[PDB]
Design a protein around this ligand. Structure first.
Ligand SMILES: CC(=O)O[C@@H](C[C@@H](O)CCO)C[C@@H](O)C[C@H](O)C[C@@H](O)C[C@@H](O)CCO
Ligand SMILES: [Cl-]
Length: 391
């Protein structure tokens, strides 16, 4: 009969935040991006449609407050162009401008704009004052557009092609309302989740390809949101906050989460040979971190799936891949494959391994650095997922 008309918000797009100024031990300080009387227009693909939306902004890693002078949303028509008749002001407790203290995030008021799944919207932010923005999603695999003055409502962003970025600045979630029964699948992980080496602006990240499979099968109310961070590790900060410390924010607290796909750990193994020799971790320490995350998510009623760590022999031999890294990988994957605690294994390693040599990525799926898949590899990852377990 009639679907009960109680409406709810659902995460329809996400990006995990990193501190752009955070660096490895012994590394030189890194500068954050700044804006000064400038507009940045982000573009993002919605997983879930619905009748109204909310924008979550972030100063999580600011060292002092920032002020969003104006925030607007519109349907994107490609590049920096918007459908101007859909342009809406984003307000926060009724205000067009909002100040976020250092370390805080904020969900906007509801915006009355009906949106459809697998379509792109533009979220434009104007910063009138000098604004340090260390809170970013570094690897957007998506062009952002920066221009002078308040261009938040402009049809297109007027500036130089050098005034482009591929990051998201203080923009961490897009939530969309619906009365329909809805699943939200959070993909949690490192660059292989984030989509490094997938084609920029082409929505070829494996979660995008998974989303495509769901909608093709008719499941327009099963959403997939991306909580990958390129370079991320379970047990140590950089790149991005440690998987253990960000798991509550980036998985448990995602609006409407029902399912999680966890693929994380290869950087815990790879970083210790050279990038961070003081941060060696055992397979046991990685398994303990995974266990605690799994327990926390199951206690919330989330279905938890864990991916096996994909082969990476050939990845900067002796400086990322090592025999020690491989032994830890095998121990972790044996633990995953035999775990009775998780709701299911997604054997990404089996889907992507070289049939000629199981310790390497299949050459047809190799972006060329022996570690990150290409578009075909990310599509193959999505094809390896049983859609019935996301119900
Ligand atoms: C495969 C791959 O991606 O490896 C990446 C991973 C990072 O990008 C993090 C990704 O999350 C690190 C790798 O590039 C580091 C280099 O191997 C270091 C050597 O070049 C040092 C020697 O040259 C020194 C000679 O004295
Ligand atoms: Cl599988």
């Amino acid at each position: 009969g009639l679907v009960p008309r109680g409406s709810h918000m659902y995460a329809s797009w996400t990006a995990s935040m990193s501190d752009a100024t955070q660096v490895l031990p012994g590394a030189a300080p890194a500068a954050s991006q700044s804006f000064n009387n400038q507009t940045v227009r982000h573009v993002l693909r919605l997983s879930l449609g619905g009748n109204t939306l909310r924008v979550k902004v972030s100063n999580l890693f600011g060292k002092s407050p920032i002020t969003f002078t104006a925030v607007r949303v519109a349907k994107s028509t490609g590049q920096s162009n918007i459908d101007v008749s859909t342009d809406k002001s984003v307000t926060f407790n009724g205000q067009a401008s909002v100040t976020l203290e250092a370390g805080t995030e904020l969900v906007s008021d509801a915006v009355n704009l009906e949106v459809a799944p697998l379509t792109n919207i533009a979220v434009s932010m104007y910063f009138s004052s000098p604004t340090a923005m260390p809170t970013v999603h570094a690897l957007g695999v998506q062009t952002a557009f920066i221009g002078a003055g308040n261009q938040t409502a402009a049809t297109s962003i007027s500036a130089a092609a050098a005034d482009q970025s591929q990051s998201y600045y203080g923009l961490t979630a897009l939530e969309v309302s619906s009365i329909q029964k809805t699943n939200v699948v959070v993909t949690f992980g490192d660059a292989i989740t984030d989509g490094y080496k997938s084609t920029v602006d082409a929505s070829k990240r494996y979660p995008n390809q998974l989303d495509d499979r769901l909608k093709t099968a008719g499941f327009s109310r099963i959403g997939v949101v991306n909580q990958g961070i390129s370079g991320n590790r379970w047990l140590n900060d950089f790149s991005g906050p440690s998987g253990t410390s960000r798991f509550d924010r980036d998985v448990l607290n995602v609006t409407g989460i029902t399912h999680a796909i966890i693929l994380l750990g290869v950087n815990d193994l790879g970083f210790s040979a050279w990038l961070a020799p003081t941060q060696t971790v055992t397979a046991e320490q990685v398994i303990a971190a995974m266990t605690t995350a799994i327990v926390k998510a199951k206690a919330k009623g989330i279905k938890v799936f864990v991916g096996t760590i994909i082969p990476f022999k050939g990845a900067s031999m002796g400086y990322y891949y090592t025999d020690a890294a491989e032994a830890k990988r095998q121990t972790i994957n044996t633990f995953i494959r035999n775990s009775k605690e998780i709701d299911g294994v997604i054997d990404f390693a089996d889907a992507l391994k070289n049939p000629a040599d199981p310790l390497t990525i299949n050459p047809i799926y190799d972006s060329g650095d022996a570690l990150h898949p290409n578009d075909a590899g990310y599509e193959a990852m999505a094809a390896a997922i049983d859609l019935s377990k996301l119900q």
